Amino acid sequence: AASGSALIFDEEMSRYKLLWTDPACEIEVPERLTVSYEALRTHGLAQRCKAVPVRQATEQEILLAHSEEYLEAVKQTPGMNVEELMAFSKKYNDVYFHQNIYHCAKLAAGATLQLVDSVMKREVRNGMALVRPPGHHSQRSAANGFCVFNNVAFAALYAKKNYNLNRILIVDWDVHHGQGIQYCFEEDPSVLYFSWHRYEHQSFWPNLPESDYSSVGKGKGSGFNINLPWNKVGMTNSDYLAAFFHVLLPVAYEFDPELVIVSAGFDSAIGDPEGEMCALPEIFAHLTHLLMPLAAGKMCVVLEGGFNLTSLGQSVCQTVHSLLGDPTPRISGLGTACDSALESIQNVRNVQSSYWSSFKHLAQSVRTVVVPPPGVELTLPKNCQHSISESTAKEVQRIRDKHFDLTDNILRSLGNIISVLDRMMRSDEVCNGCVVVSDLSVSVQCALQHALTEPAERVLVVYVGDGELPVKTNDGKVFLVQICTKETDKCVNRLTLCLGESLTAGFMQALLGLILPVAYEFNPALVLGIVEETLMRVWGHMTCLIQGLARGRMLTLLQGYDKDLLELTVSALSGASISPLGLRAPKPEDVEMMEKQRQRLQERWGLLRCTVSESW
Ligand SMILES: NCCCNCCCCCS
Ligand SMILES: [K+]
Numbered sequence: 001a002a003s004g005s006a007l008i009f010d011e012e013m014s015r016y017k018l019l020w021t022d023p024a025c026e027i028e029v030p031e032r033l034t035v036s037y038e039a040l041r042t043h044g045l046a047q048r049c050k051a052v053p054v055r056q057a058t059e060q061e062i063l064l065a066h067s068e069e070y071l072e073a074v075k076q077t078p079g080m081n082v083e084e085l086m087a088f089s090k091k092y093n094d095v096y097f098h099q100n101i102y103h104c105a106k107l108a109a110g111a112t113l114q115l116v117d118s119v120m121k122r123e124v125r126n127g128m129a130l131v132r133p134p135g136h137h138s139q140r141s142a143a144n145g146f147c148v149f150n151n152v153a154f155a156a157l158y159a160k161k162n163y164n165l166n167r168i169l170i171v172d173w174d175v176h177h178g179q180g181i182q183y184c185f186e187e188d189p190s191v192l193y194f195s196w197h198r199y200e201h202q203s204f205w206p207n208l209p210e211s212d213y214s215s216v217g218k219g220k221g222s223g224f225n226i227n228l229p230w231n232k233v234g235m236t237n238s239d240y241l242a243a244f245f246h247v248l249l250p251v252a253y254e255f256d257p258e259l260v261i262v263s264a265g266f267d268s269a270i271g272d273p274e275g276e277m278c279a280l281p282e283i284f285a286h287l288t289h290l291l292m293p294l295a296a297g298k299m300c301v302v303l304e305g306g307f308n309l310t311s312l313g314q315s316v317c318q319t320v321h322s323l324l325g326d327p328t329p330r331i332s333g334l335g336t337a338c339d340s341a342l343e344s345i346q347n348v349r350n351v352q353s354s355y356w357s358s359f360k361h362l363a364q365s366v367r368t369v370v371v372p373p374p375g376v377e378l379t380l381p382k383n384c385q386h387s388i389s390e391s392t393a394k395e396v397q398r399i400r401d402k403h404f405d406l407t408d409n410i411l412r413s414l415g416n417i418i419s420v421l422d423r424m425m426r427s428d429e430v431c432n433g434c435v436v437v438s439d440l441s442v443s444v445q446c447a448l449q450h451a452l453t454e455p456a457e458r459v460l461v462v463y464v465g466d467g468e469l470p471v472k473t474n475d476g477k478v479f480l481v482q483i484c485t486k487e488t489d490k491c492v493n494r495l496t497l498c499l500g501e502s503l504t505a506g507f508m509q510a511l512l513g514l515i516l517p518v519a520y521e522f523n524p525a526l527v528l529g530i531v532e533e534t535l536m537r538v539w540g541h542m543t544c545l546i547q548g549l550a551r552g553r554m555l556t557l558l559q560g561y562d563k564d565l566l567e568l569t570v571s572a573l574s575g576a577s578i579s580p581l582g583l584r585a586p587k588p589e590d591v592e593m594m595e596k597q598r599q600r601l602q603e604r605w606g607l608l609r610c611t612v613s614e615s616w
């Protein structure tokens, strides 16, 4: 398997700039590139990434997405003086040309293809290209919006031609609409293009009717173009995560892409003079993390916009942090999306429902610790320590006589639970861990009770099994997610899902649609996973997507030793790549059960809302 993350960058792409007065392009400056690199250098992130060199893009690659006449016209700009460059840039909308811009354009394009080759050749797990000029606005025969050539369009066509890829996902989280990318794959069902963008009912640049949710692609492309227009400024983290949980992620895991490419513009972050949104830079660590279980982790992030220097570098670092697998920051203050965001989300799901049936509605440096059974020895990755002090032993005896006739190996089960939790919360040495347990009722109790006194303000508990558990969920510092078989629901602090071939596709619709939005709003300090001894084709995706909560501090208790189950949970806990999936659409009885639970919880947990609220 691949390892590492590529950082493709080169100082040469900062050696072109605007040469005349133009309020439309003043914000696009070479310092966007140098600030982003020094921010990665300061935080020690560039030093941890494999620096792949930048190459030029051959004209045969440039013609994959551009016309000969437009290439021939751009090819002539290096010979123009500034007066001739003014005239040539007036032919296009909101773009300037420099003597060196054709050179850097071929470098930005080449840098993307370099990143594609590195990721597809398994030389790296993922990567980011810090490039200039941007791409997503440029079209087959025109420059547009600071873009000369469509770098991300090249990546997808290049990876189609040179690797026989049939399913590519392009996620454009820049605040502007990537109309060049939409045009280029409009009638193409092999490249799924998702884009949210500041729209304001067409009043915001580039003022295109086809930027609206109505455009779902033409011909057989239909359903493989997803526009999510923001019609008000000031969108927050909850708006962004709602758009992911209820639009992009359901479609993405169903598409099952073989490669994920990101038009990463950070003009969608707080402080940016162009987007005027209010998402904090930490949101991009989660946007990145939620997409890594796709395409076995093969993700190529390409830079687009982002024009506030004092804030651009922070969002770049958060993205690379997640690319390298570092723990994701806790997001606090999440709730329902605002009404306009709920409007667009509700609209885009309706138009797309005729292509993605899950949108239908009824009419109205040690990272992991493994503690296997005694005598068991397994082969663990380089970041798993494989596991008891006397201070811990007195505690197990202290709890022994007060709460538990307990004469048993089991006393070693609880002694490990206490010290793996000690090393996760206090010492900050380990990040997460997994422990195979004998008896649940006692192990669940000691794990949860010792966690609340670590201290853990709030504990999310995910339990896969039937029957009740010794967990009191009244105080509100504990939320319980139980996946069982028998129909069990009461208070608004428990989520029970009583689920055939059906299941794996239903569990995914529930994980992204119900489990993740509640967990993200709950903001736990620790996730506690439990699996009964009594078929988790999805548990790797579950344990990976849930690591966005609680800074990645999760403790799994597996009842009964299963060789390949424990092998999988450790692999996802330690940060390895996750294998994809196919599956059969969920049964109607399960979709009904799922939304009957959204009705019951979305009043308290507003992040579950994917429609505008029914005002009394
Ligand atoms: N005030 C000038 C607005 C021109 N819009 C250019 C598009 C920039 C997006 C690059 S991603
Ligand atoms: K966008």
Ligand SMILES: [K+]
Binding pocket: 185, 186, 187, 188, 189, 190, 191, 192, 193, 217, 221, 224, 225
């Ligand atoms: K498409």
Ligand SMILES: [Zn+2]
Binding pocket: 174, 175, 176, 265, 267, 304, 305, 306
């Ligand atoms: Zn932009």
